[PDB]
Amino acid sequence: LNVQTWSTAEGAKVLFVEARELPMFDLRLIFAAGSSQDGNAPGVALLTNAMLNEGVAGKDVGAIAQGFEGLGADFGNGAYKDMAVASLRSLSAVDKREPALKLFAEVVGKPTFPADSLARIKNQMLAGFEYQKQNPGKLASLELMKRLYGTHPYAHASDGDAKSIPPITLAQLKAFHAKAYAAGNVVIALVGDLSRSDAEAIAAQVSAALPKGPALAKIEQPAEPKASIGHIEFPSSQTSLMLAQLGIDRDDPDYAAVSLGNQILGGGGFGTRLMSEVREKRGLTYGVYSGFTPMQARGPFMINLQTRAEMSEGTLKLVQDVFAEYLKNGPTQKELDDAKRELAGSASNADIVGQLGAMGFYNLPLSYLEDFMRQSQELTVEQVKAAMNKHLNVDKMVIVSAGPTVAQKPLE
Template sequence: MIRAVFSSFAFVLLAALPLRAEVEIQEVTSPGGIHAWLVESHEVPFVSVEIRFQGGASLDAPGKRGAINLMTGLLEEGAGEMDARTFARERDALAASYRFDVSSDSLAVSARMLTENRDRAVGLLRQALVAPRFDQDAIDRVRAQVISGIRSDATDPNAIAGQTFDRIAFGDHPYATPISGTEASVNALTRDDLIAARDRVIARDRLYVAAAGDISAEDLGKMLDTLLGDLPETGAPMPGPAPLNLAGGVTVVPFDTPQSVAVFGQRGLDRDDPDFFAAFVMNQILGGGGFGARLMEEVRVKRGLTYGVYSYLMPMDHAALIMGQVASGNDKIAEAVEVIRDEWARMAEQGATEDELAKVKTYLTGAYPLRFDGNGPIARILVGMQMEGLTPDYVKTRNDRIRAVTLDDVRRVAADWLDPAHLQFIVVGQPQGLETTN
């Protein structure tokens, strides 16, 4: 109940905060040498902290797929002298909130805490990071939850499509397999495997931290050393670049469903590519802008083939893609695939129009300040910027970079990067008029 009360209280406070794109970012280094970014704001008596450990589930040891995912799910299931129930009671008594998530590229820790309880909330979170218990009853409970998710994914067309795409695209790289592992690999994991998994990813040599809210730079430095100073210095080495085995064409995965799901993708740009902003704007016109985008206009509005279709840039740590997804009736998906490929080619050959570019610039620059709508979102933005190698002034220059994209830039990146011949479609369902071509 206390946790629910804090959530409601925090929502009211967040709603009262001004929207701030012109945030003032301080770079903080703790006495122990831990770096962080801070947006200091004393309007509301709480602070949000975002922590990232680069590498994520891609650092699973050979033969231990799913270990880091399972370990992450256990970080809040007891620590130090506290079992899972005692830990939960302590957290709720402090009106603190912790969240632990893992992806292919990072393990994320999100924390919110009231100023008056900050020291004790930090101490409790520290226990979860440096001394998780991994009690057998907790392992068995969370393992069952993971396996339930794996079984659910096996009957979910969207999950099947995504996993099939990854398996084809990434070969023997960790990206090729689900971070949750398989039922067999998860069942085989032991407590020792989970301890080893923690040590592979939770380490200071891959650490990024951001904070926003009611805390000074000096106090944040002290907090960083208390919270993170006792972590191991180094973790497992990062995997190398992922291959991209995308020959183009269609792969059909038969599945008994009245509606087919299609995932499509091709090679993309790294986040630090000089053309990334132009490509970002180009994709917004092509498939990223909802009802204003070409794919939505051609596939849904004009032809009624789907309720939604979209594309997006997907720069990861070890690969980069331009991706998209659509769902349509089995009798319509073949036409949807054809229209998407035609629009891919039309953008590559002709680029965009002045009107499309102007509208997208207005939208992208106007929407950006709305992302800074509270301490939590600000801290998440800041830690993401660090991981992408951006500098603190990015929040002040980002919209200028969008405005600087010209029509010639959009046409050039579309011609250079969009590759309809190598656009790979994975279609899950019983599509009429579509067969596997590769």
Template sequence: MTDTLLPNQTTTRLLSAQGLVLDEPTLINTEIQSWTDDSGARVRFIESHGLPMVDVQLVFKAGTTQDTDYPGLAALTLYNLDEGSAGKSASEFAERLESLGALFEKSSRLEYSTLTLRTLSAKEVLDPAIALFTDLVARPDFPAAGLEKVKAQLLGQRAALEKSPAIRATAEVYRHLFAGHPYGTPEGSSEQGIAAITTDDLKAFHGKAYSANNLEISLVGDLSREDAERITQQLSQALPQGWAAAELPPLPTPSPGRIHIEQPGASNVMALALPMAVPADAPEQLNLILANEVLGSGLNSRLMQALRQQRGLTYDISSALNPLRVGGLFMVRWEVAAEYVDASLQLVRQTVQDFIEQGPTAAELLAAHRQLTGPMLRNVAQNRRLAALLGEMGYKQLPDDYLSTYLPRLAALTPEQVRDALQANLDINMSIEVSVGPASDQQPLPPVPAE
């Protein structure tokens, strides 16, 4: 079922969705109810009765940063949850879920693992769907046959990813910038780690990392507060209790560097990354979000203008922020012909450096605010995406009014504030630069065509 706002729902979430004036601050009305349940799980809930649907998202601090003894343990634990639970086989679980019309998804990241359930809100569907979801998350059987199957799948996935120049470039950035830190193993697994892991290891990791007080729960949909409390209690009380993930250590002192990885092909994938000491919940993240939009998002970004529009060096170039709990990074990535690796890198360095020194113009900030407004309004208008936003807010420890004040706070930022945030948090001299592709004799930049 498509999850879109019906005409008579507009006012429940947005003050103005039609006839929106993007030059004026837009308010998002999201009444977030939050609490910590008896088991220590932290809950955020938005009541929305426009569609007979419920979206549940569980975010456990159970990512790859927690499995340093056996790289791959976090991923294998997550992906084995639906291989058999509470005596039901993987096929029985899947068939039962399908019969209810419910959808289940899971994903693993550096810092957390996520499980989501989407189901109809009718009690005769919701209750058995939540019961199945609870069994899967809290009572996995971890059968040996399932572990061997998932091991083979994970090894195959690793082999496929290692052939991707873009994945290799990104992984090398993380390894270099975060050497010696849990962030420094971006693949989340190793062949040796996968081979060594047993079902006992899965059970031990699950018994800790999937504890209730290591959990953020998000619910959005056709529920009352009483219903939401009942569901969260059912989930959290079934989970292991009393373990919380250790806080991550500070980031290592960064060191600049240049790395080339030889790989056959017609072009090189390039990455230029800068470390950020500012954590995900820092107020200045909003300044950096706007700055990133100006520098490397869309056809009119500064990087796109410099490399594609003016010189035709690449089809696409973009920048991205990756804020993490104890820092993060800013990265530019593009693809270029092998003979322009050095020249394009110097052009990107200069464009980024100029932007850090000068900051954006007022016109660029207005355009960036417009670009960010549309996606945010679409996200809060779709329950599944809204549940994901709540989960992200919880994990990053953002306040309950984060969504409702997001767009006005963006609109209030000045070019000077954004420039100051750039200068305080990014240093081009600390960049790590990676190229993946064939080596070639280098050529200077092609001239800018005359207008």
């Protein structure tokens, strides 16, 4: 496709793809306003993002939702470690998109942050922390990110904690919003039934409604953690196991190589090394997965699965052996091909706008999409093995288990 890009007067990065198949369009705003920008107030980024559509001049939470619905539009939001998102899907018809866009602009650019909404959202978050202590996987991953990142901004939970949420004030949210939702801190992605002229108008309108400000400081790289094995005691006949170490950052040149290499190890299914060895041949789990989560700074590489508590010790060694062998010998030409073929089979405005968001946010080449498919079928078994060994090491894994401490049964 023909990806077009430019910047607004306020400094926003714009990426656009014209798609006339459907009388609709997707607008996605990506801000460098993830939890990594939390500073001394864990949870403030997530709280700010969740509060956007709780109120604007003249409209309470209900009226805003009704506003979008009545116009045939869908609003979406979310906060993560690197970014925070605000999105709109709407009919392309001028009479529908105009009021939808002005409302969207008001919600993301001029939220009023109603006091009652804040109290309600905090309560939901506090209740959430309580339910979380009943989810082994959630506890294991939280522990795992702490051991992996230490004091780095990516270490703390995005939603903060019971201690940090209560003190957050409306003033802190307004201050964070003014700084992190600034035009110079955003990427405007558009895909749909629009001309480049309409796209420019839309992007400019959004950019002008946002608070004025420069981009925030980028996140530094984390220090490599030391290998370790932790355990979280939890009642259940099952045990959640997670293994991880630092992976790559989104802009790393070996992205295509490590992603294909990962597909073979623990991607979707039955065919992978892990699913066949752990699930297919031994029936020790209903699902085992592996994957990289590239961010601005080095993201984590993780392997996760659940098994019967009495088989956990044995299954862990098995996963470690499978991983060790894979890094040592790499993939077979047969696995690589099936991997490329599988990939060859994997677009809507939504899927595209999502990619444009990452392309602009991580400053990837305009040709990113094509470059990825192209680089990916070109890769040889030797390039994949080299890339995996360059970014992963068997002696760097941080392991966290969550389940009961019970007698262990060796694998049969």
